[PDB]
Write a protein that binds this ligand. Structure first.
Ligand SMILES: [Zn+2]
Lengths: 129, 25, 87, 206, 96, 117, 62, 97, 217
RNA sequence: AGGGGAUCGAAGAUGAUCAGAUACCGUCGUAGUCUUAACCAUAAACUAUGCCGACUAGGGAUCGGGUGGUGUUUUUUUAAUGACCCACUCGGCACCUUACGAGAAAUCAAAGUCUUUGGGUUCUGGGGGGAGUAUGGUCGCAAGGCUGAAACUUAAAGGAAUUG
């Protein structure tokens, strides 16, 4: 059965870019998906996306604009001490000057760069680059 | 020898060793 | 790719496909650069002055090479009523 | 972009419906569905001829702008278009390739047929898959004459047609020649027909 | 996927299941059955000193061919009978 | 069996290609031509060759041979490849479209005389 | 397999290699001196070669 | 390695099928396997229809046929070259000759 | 005296094309080894290994020599050539040619701070030639090339100073490892960092700019 | 254990074959083969491929259901029904082509989305032997099933492909 929704989603996105596709249909929608795409689109990795109101759970149509190599989930959502944030970004990102490990803190879902500044930490949701 | 018949061999062997032990109750 | 005092280091800035914006690699020999001419006042095509698209080896092998151009053409105002966004 | 004299003009549309290039293939094949207008009863597909010509103009548009006219290789192993590509190559600088294509042309520079073009035209992507494959080892754009059920791999701008014989291959090749001559070359006044018959691109046998 | 629990709470299973597989490894299992203390001729000790009983002319295996000069020894701390090889040209004459 | 080798047949293809007008249908005359336009090391070969050159000749003058073409033949094929009647498009009684193909022209902006099927 | 072979010739060859005494020589330098010897020798003057240079060649090819 | 994506013959989505006995061997073989050839001939054979139709009664009559569906196992079908070996590729062709 | 037999070869000798990148940029199939010989001389070459391989004939046997050559300066360019032939001397020779015709461009970068002249790699990269996967990782200055000698040399000529390598699979079948570290650095110019999101209008291609001077007889 | 016991047929007997021939071939035939009431728990019990979820590609067949077609064919007059034809859509046993991708390869629409390594979850393997052995426990009337070592030994054992 469905066990992540957010992993199901980022997958379809990856398989879309890979196969040269320019759009995706993401079912179902969810808050965690939404704020994730925000962190993605705000950094220029996707285009516009658009929720669809079925009286159920949602759908999204995202616009891929190339330049996306891999957006991924990390499962389970591991607990990350603030000093271990580094050892993740070291592990699952290409170089020290781009790409993002987007987390989830009690100060809201955000990328590791930002959360570094706000001096917050928490659980790790996934990665983008 | 063929795996099947080596099985048969060790089967025989077992029963025989079982006997030998029983020789002392 | 900059550096310290803003200088442009690194060998060469690669082309980028016009259908996927994916880099066209140095050895991508299924990559294709179609050159399309511009017509002036009635017929008489202009030499030297092109409309150029860039297709990557991957889009072409997949057979989308055609349909990509149609969408890419109309967009740049080169065709009409051929390609249709809704399918 | 291209004005309005480049529109339909039912002089041309008459040629096409006369040459029956509007009749298509029963097997659609997904990459070719936009060209489909509608399906006849008793299983037949009708190409949207406006798109044919529209693509055709784009085809001639790409044949032109190629500097040297003689390395725009026109190719046909098929017989129904063998004489045709010859006549095109006559009126254009373009070099022709009739008969067997010969594996090793585009790659392999020792061969006594090392064409090194910058554009390729193809009558049938099936029966000429050899050169289409070869073209994609060496960075070569490809115009192609595709019916409804044609392979789309490594063809770029594809002109919908019929290529099931008769006067279809002959016409599109004729129209390509007429059009590349109206562009840049020496025809001018795109409103008047041609002294050259369109029946000059038909097969022999006889 | 991957065929192992990923849950945040699956630590016991992960911990115990590796404990369970550490046995397919010799050195580990050899270290927990205390085999060196039990089976080995030395007590796991690096050396052991014994008394020579007889000389042996052991023939080597294929595709070699020679007589390999050894002695049967009774280890003092065990009473264990072990056979050891006297090395170098004619060193067997040094031992009696 | 008498199967001529490639060394022979090669010389045969080569001569005819660049010496068709001079070559004839007769062995004896051909044989003498070879001594004027080709350096051959033994008499039999020259006779062997000149005999095969005439073999191709006697069937060139009977239709084109599979894989050899000279100037005088190329010209002959060019002329004959230009025949054009009173057209065969035309139309001798309008166009005879089926239907829906008629819906095509209507949904296009075009004149033309029509028909049904 | 067979454990009782012949102990008769226990050291046949050491006992028949004709003892030849060591020809004396000047002592080689120890410590830093020796490494100095090796720096200079091996790559400052450069002697014997082949397109590879050779450490210990016996009486060459000629 | 595997030599046929059909393994032996076609079972695919079943489990078990009942056996037949080779018409030559008597060997058992799953009916899904077993090289099967229909055999239909003439009771009177080709050469003898003459002396038959001549010597008979009835206006020409109408020759009967014997109907016999043969089942061979692999070995007997191979050896009697009812089937033959094909190249790694030729094997694929399921088309009758 | 080199005699150009292809369109691309002519333009180089004709001096109209002066730099290697011009070909890499428009992605052009180099087929005349003299091309890369002029556009990049002072280019070094080293024979890595020469292993023998063997066959068997309609009677007995057959045995010939296999060479593996790496060519490159020490800046952005390297190629990998494998050639087995009836001689030592031959196998090297035709190896260098195959190596040069396969010359590749290399996107070096900075591990962290961009303080004058790149030292390592843009991103992490990795190739795989049959089981053996090689993985190159950025490294601080001083780190050096951390690899197995064979790969270490391929990278010295590749123009690298600091890197970390991580290799899985049969690292002992030499010709397989090198073929994957090659694919590795060749993939650097394939990875789209945001350094390159910026769009261009696409150059014309010197085969059309100097089209006349390019044509044949 | 009772019934049954045509057929075929372990054991056994014979006839040949062979140097021998306890066999393959022929003949005879016990048990068995079938059933009822109890056991047994194993097979290359195979797709040698865990299950649930998602996504990535083209194509024509077919089984079941449904929808659409002033389609076809049936009476005495062409309405219902029936079967059939075309399109579509679910859910099935499969098949064909391709390779973007994967593999050591053979090959694979999964064995793909894996050093750009994390959707959930069960199970098993850790060089070859010794050995499925010994010992203990347990289940079975028995045959055996499940569970299951070590001493010592060994540099290979093994997979796919290649050319002879
Ligand atoms: Zn049989």
């Amino acid at each position: 059965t469905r066990s992540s929704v957010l992993a199901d989603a980022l997958n379809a996105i990856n398989n879309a870019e890979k196969t040269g596709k320019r759009q995706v249909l993401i079912r179902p929608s969810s808050k965690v998906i939404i704020k994730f795409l925000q962190v993605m689109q705000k950094h220029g990795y996707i285009g516009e996306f658009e929720y669809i109101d079925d009286h159920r759970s949602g759908k999204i149509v995202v616009q891929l604009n190339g330049r996306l190599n891999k957006c991924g989930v990390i499962s389970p959502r591991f607990n990350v001490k603030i000093g271990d944030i580094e050892k993740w970004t070291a592990n699952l990102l290409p170089a020290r000057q781009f790409g993002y490990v987007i987390l989830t803190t009690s100060a809201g879902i955000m990328d590791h760069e930002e959360a570094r500044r706000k001096h917050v930490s928490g659980k790790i949701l996934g990665f983008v680059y | 020898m063929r795996a099947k018949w080596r099985k048969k061999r060790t089967r025989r062997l077992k029963r025989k060793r079982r006997k030998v032990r029983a020789r002392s109750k | 790719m900059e550096n310290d005092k803003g200088q442009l280091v690194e060998l060469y800035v690669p082309r980028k496909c016009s259908a996927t914006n994916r880099i066209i690699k140095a050895d991508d020999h299924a990559s294709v650069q179609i050159n399309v001419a511009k017509v002036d006042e009635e017929g008489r095509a202009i030499p030297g002055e092109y409309v150029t698209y860039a297709l990557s080896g991957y889009v072409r092998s997949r057979g989308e090479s055609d349909d990509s151009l149609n969408r890419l053409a109309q967009n740049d105002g080169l065709l009409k009523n051929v390609w249709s966004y809704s399918r | 972009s291209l004005p309005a004299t480049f529109d339909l003009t039912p002089e041309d549309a008459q040629l096409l419906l006369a040459a029956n290039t509007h009749l298509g293939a029963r097997n659609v094949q997904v990459h070719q569905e936009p060209y489909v207008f509608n399906a006849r009863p008793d299983g037949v597909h009708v190409i949207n001829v406006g798109k044919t010509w529209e693509k055709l103009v784009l085809a001639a548009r790409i044949i032109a702008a190629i500097p040297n006219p003689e390395d725009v290789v026109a190719i046909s192993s098929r017989t129904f278009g063998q004489r045709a590509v010859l006549k095109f190559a006559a009126h254009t600088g373009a070099t022709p390739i009739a008969g067997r294509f010969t594996p090793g042309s585009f790659t392999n520079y020792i061969t006594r047929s090392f064409k090194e073009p910058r554009l390729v035209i193809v009558t049938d992507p099936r029966s000429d898959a050899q050169a289409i494959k070869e073209a994609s080892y060496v960075n070569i754009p490809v115009i192609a004459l595709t019916d409804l059920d044609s392979p789309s791999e490594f063809v770029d701008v594809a002109i919908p047609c019929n290529n099931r014989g008769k006067h279809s291959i002959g016409l599109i090749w004729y129209l390509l020649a007429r059009e590349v001559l109206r562009l840049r070359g020496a025809l001018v006044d795109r409103t008047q027909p041609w002294s050259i018959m369109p029946d000059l691109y038909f097969y022999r046998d006889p | 996927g991957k065929g192992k629990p990923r849950g945040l709470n699956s630590a016991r299973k992960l911990r115990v299941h590796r404990r369970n597989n550490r046995w397919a490894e010799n050195n580990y299992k050899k270290r927990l059955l205390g085999t060196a203390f039990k089976s080995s001729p030395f007590g796991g000790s690096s050396h052991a000193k014994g008394i020579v009983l007889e000389k042996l002319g052991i023939e080597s295996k294929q595709p070699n061919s020679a007589i390999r000069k050894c002695v049967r020894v009774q280890l003092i701390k065990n009473g264990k009978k072990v056979t050891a090889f006297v090395p170098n040209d004619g060193c067997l004459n040094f031992v009696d | 069996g008498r199967v001529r080798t490639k060394t022979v047949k090669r010389a045969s293809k080569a001569l005819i290609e660049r010496y068709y007008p001079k070559l004839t249908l007769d062995f004896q005359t051909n044989k003498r031509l070879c001594d004027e336009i080709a350096t051959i090391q033994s008499k039999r070969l020259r006779n062997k060759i000149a005999g095969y050159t005439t073999h191709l000749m006697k069937r060139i003058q009977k239709g084109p041979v599979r894989g050899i073409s000279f100037k005088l033949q190329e010209e002959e094929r060019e002329r004959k490849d230009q025949y054009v009647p009173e057209v065969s498009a035309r139309s001798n009684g309008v166009l005879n479209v089926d239907n829906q193909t008629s819906d095509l022209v209507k949904s296009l902006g075009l004149k033309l005389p029509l028909s049904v099927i | 397999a067979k454990v009782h072979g012949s102990l008769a010739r226990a050291g046949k060859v050491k006992s028949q290699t004709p003892k030849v005494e060591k020809t004396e020589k000047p002592k080689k330098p120890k410590g830093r001196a020796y490494k100095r010897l090796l720096y200079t020798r091996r790559f400052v003057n450069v002697t014997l070669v082949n397109g590879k240079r050779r450490m210990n060649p016996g009486p060459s090819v000629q | 390695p595997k030599k046929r994506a059909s393994n032996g013959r076609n079972k695919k989505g079943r489990g078990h099928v009942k056996p037949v006995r080779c018409v030559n061997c008597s060997k058992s073989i799953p009916k899904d396997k077993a090289i099967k050839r229909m055999a239909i001939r003439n009771i009177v054979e080709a050469a003898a229809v003459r002396d038959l139709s001549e010597a008979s009664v009835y206006p020409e009559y109408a020759l009967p046929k014997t109907y016999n569906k043969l089942h061979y196992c692999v070995s007997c079908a191979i050896h009697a070259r009812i089937v033959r070996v094909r190249s790694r590729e030729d094997r694929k062709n399921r088309a009758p000759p | 005296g080199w005699v150009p037999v292809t369109k691309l070869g002519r333009l180089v000798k004709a001096g109209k094309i002066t730099t290697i990148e011009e070909i890499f940029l428009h992605s052009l199939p180099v087929k005349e080894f003299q091309i890369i010989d002029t556009l990049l001389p002072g280019l070094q070459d080293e024979v890595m290994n020469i292993k023998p391989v063997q066959k068997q004939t309609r009677a007995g046997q057959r045995t010939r020599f296999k060479a593996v050559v790496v060519v490159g300066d020490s800046n952005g360019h390297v190629g990998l050539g494998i050639k087995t032939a009836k001689e030592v001397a031959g196998a090297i020779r035709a190896g260098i040619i195959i190596a040069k015709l396969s010359v590749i461009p290399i996107r070096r970068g900075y591990w962290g701070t961009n303080l004058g002249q790149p030292h390592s790699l843009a991103t992490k990269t990795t190739g795989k030639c049959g089981s053996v996967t090689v993985r190159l990782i950025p490294a601080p200055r001083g780190s050096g090339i951390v690899a197995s000698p064979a790969v270490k040399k391929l990278l010295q000529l590749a123009g690298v100073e600091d890197v970390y390598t991580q290799s899985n699979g049969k690292t002992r079948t030499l010709e397989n490892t090198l073929k994957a570290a090659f694919v590795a650095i060749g993939n650097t110019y394939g990875f789209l960092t945001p350094n390159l999101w910026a769009e261009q209008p696409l150059p014309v291609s010197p085969l059309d700019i100097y089209s006349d001077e390019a044509s044949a007889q």
